[PDB]
Amino acid sequence: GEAPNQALLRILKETEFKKIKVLGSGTVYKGLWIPEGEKVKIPVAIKELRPKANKEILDEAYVMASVDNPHVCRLLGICLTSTVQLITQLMPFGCLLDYVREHKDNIGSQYLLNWCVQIAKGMNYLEDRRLVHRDLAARNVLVKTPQHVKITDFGLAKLVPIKWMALESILHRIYTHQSDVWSYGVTVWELMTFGSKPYDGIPASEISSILEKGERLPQPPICTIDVYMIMVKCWMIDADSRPKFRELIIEFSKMARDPQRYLVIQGDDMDDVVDADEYL
Ligand SMILES: CC(C)(C)Cn1c(N)nc2ccc(-c3[nH]c(C(C)(C)C)nc3-c3ccc(F)cc3)nc21
Incomplete structure (x- = not known):
């Protein structure tokens, strides 16, 4: 009776985005995201962690990835570098x-x-x-x-x-x-x-x-x-x-x-x- 959550979770190469400025302290960055081979640039906020609160951020990413509405923040992707980086809209x-x-x-x-x-x-x-x-x-x-x-x-x-x-x-x-x-x-x-x-x-x-x-x-x-x-x-x-x-x-x-x-x-x-x- 509950529908299957078919939301997609998108993994990003660290290659695909650049930090620019710190917005707060893990740590959040103003940054730009160039999807791989797409000729678009997307202003983003990037949160790279710095621990077992690795479980907390994946829950957020789980949620953020399952919503899509003009008045809720959506996950753009995650990046599983040596720390977890979450990418979302600036x-x-x-x-x-x-x-x-x-x-x-x-x-x-x-x-x-x-x-x-x-x-x-x-x-x-x-x-x-x-x-x-x-x-x-x-x-x-x-x-x-x-x-x-x-x-x-x-x-x-x-x-x-x-x-x-x-x-x-x-x-x-x-x-x-x-x-x-x-x-x-x-x-x-x-x-x-x-x-x-x-x-x-x-x-x-x-x-x-x-x-x-x-x-x-x-x-x-x-x-x-x-x-x-x-x-x-x-x-x-x-x-x-x-x-x-x-x-x-x-x-x-x-x-x-x-x-x-x-x-x-x-x-x-x-x-x-x-x-x-x-x-x-
Ligand atoms: C906070 C600010 C308004 C001054 C800066 N800020 C602006 N200007 N836009 C933003 C968009 C998102 C976030 C953001 N805040 C946090 C805390 C609160 C957990 C620290 N996490 C994220 C984040 C979540 C998921 C993700 F994939 C990437 C980042 N911050 C943003």
């Missing part, structure tokens, strides 16, 4: 959490609402593929262009960050697609607050209890009650009361159609290069 504008901090005084309602739509789209795809993220958060969304974000970090993904977790996750390490909706709510509240830290200062030992008291994250200043309503439904203790990712797509799309009705915001060589999203 997300030029970094991670949405940093981006919303760096650009807050020029992010408008249309962008925020569209990010909410794209993230719900990605998350709904993971649901389709009977996949649970378990670590949805603003830090784990990357920005290809400002008009185009993708869900990432598939370490935790299955077929810790207490301040992002459904209550049933905090209590009984339970995890659903509805557990992910709760984290979707926190993520939106991150965006809606231009990168504020949830429950700032509250020690995470208390988080489980305050939520039992019925407390939740406050309504961000830019948020109409319509938007905040939606965030609050993602945080029902009754997980079947929370909204479905397909419904969040619909709701935020409705609003994206008239964004200023729903968010009130003061002031509304490189020759053969092909973007990964066009390399099939």
Whole structure:
């Protein structure tokens, strides 16, 4: 009744790509990928490890290779040199959490609402593929262009960050697609607050209890009650009361159609290069 995962895992020669710049510390690189004998150049992020966490990175690669959706990060390949190197599409504008901090005084309602739509789209795809993220958060969304974000970090993904977790996750390490909706709510509240830290200062030992008291994250200043309503439904203790990712797509799309009705915001060589999203 479960279908066979016929995703392909592509092994790359170290020959086939070049590092260019360090993006962070294993270690991730901006780099270019020339497929073998194809006359295309593909901007990539390359993660070469530096151990028995070799099991952890293969799980990520397994997951990343089995997804294909415009709002989830796909594996381009792996390279089994003396360390494991994973190759994936370069997300030029970094991670949405940093981006919303760096650009807050020029992010408008249309962008925020569209990010909410794209993230719900990605998350709904993971649901389709009977996949649970378990670590949805603003830090784990990357920005290809400002008009185009993708869900990432598939370490935790299955077929810790207490301040992002459904209550049933905090209590009984339970995890659903509805557990992910709760984290979707926190993520939106991150965006809606231009990168504020949830429950700032509250020690995470208390988080489980305050939520039992019925407390939740406050309504961000830019948020109409319509938007905040939606965030609050993602945080029902009754997980079947929370909204479905397909419904969040619909709701935020409705609003994206008239964004200023729903968010009130003061002031509304490189020759053969092909973007990964066009390399099939
Ligand atoms: C993080 C950044 C936004 C500042 C840099 N960055 C940009 N700009 N695009 C990116 C795309 C991917 C990654 C990336 N991050 C990680 C950590 C978080 C495990 C360290 N692993 C990978 C990676 C996963 C699979 C793979 F095949 C190749 C790389 N980083 C990217």
